């Protein structure tokens, strides 16, 4: 977000989960969301 080294104390777990989950409704052998959840 800041284009600079991450500040200590930033919680990157929540940020990662949100970053992965956010475009979950945009996702359209397995493809898309079922594949993601499969992995």
């Amino acid at each position: 977000s800041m284009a600079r080294p991450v500040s200590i104390g930033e919680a990157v777990g929540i940020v990662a989960a949100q970053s992965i989950g956010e475009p979950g409704t945009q996702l359209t052998i397995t493809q898309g969301l079922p594949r993601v959840i499969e992995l």
Binding site: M2, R4, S7, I8, G9, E10
Partner: protein, 94 residues
Amino acid sequence: AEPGIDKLFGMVDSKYRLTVVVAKRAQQLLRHGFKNTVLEPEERPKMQTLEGLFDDPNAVTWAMKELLTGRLVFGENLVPEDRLQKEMERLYPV
């Protein structure tokens, strides 16, 4: 955008440390009634009322401007908290 936010982020190793410093400093300014301010009378943040310019009631803005000046010293394990509070209560009674 907050004025000089890039510089303020530049002053610290972590943005959250900047937040802590600003918060604590604002608390110190509220407790001592802005009597401990390092700002000159012409450097004082102003608010526009119906009457005229008064002092900016917001302690956070004050703290950020003070921090911008460079007259403040921040860090860990500088002084003991008790000694600090006693000296501060002596220099600026409430």
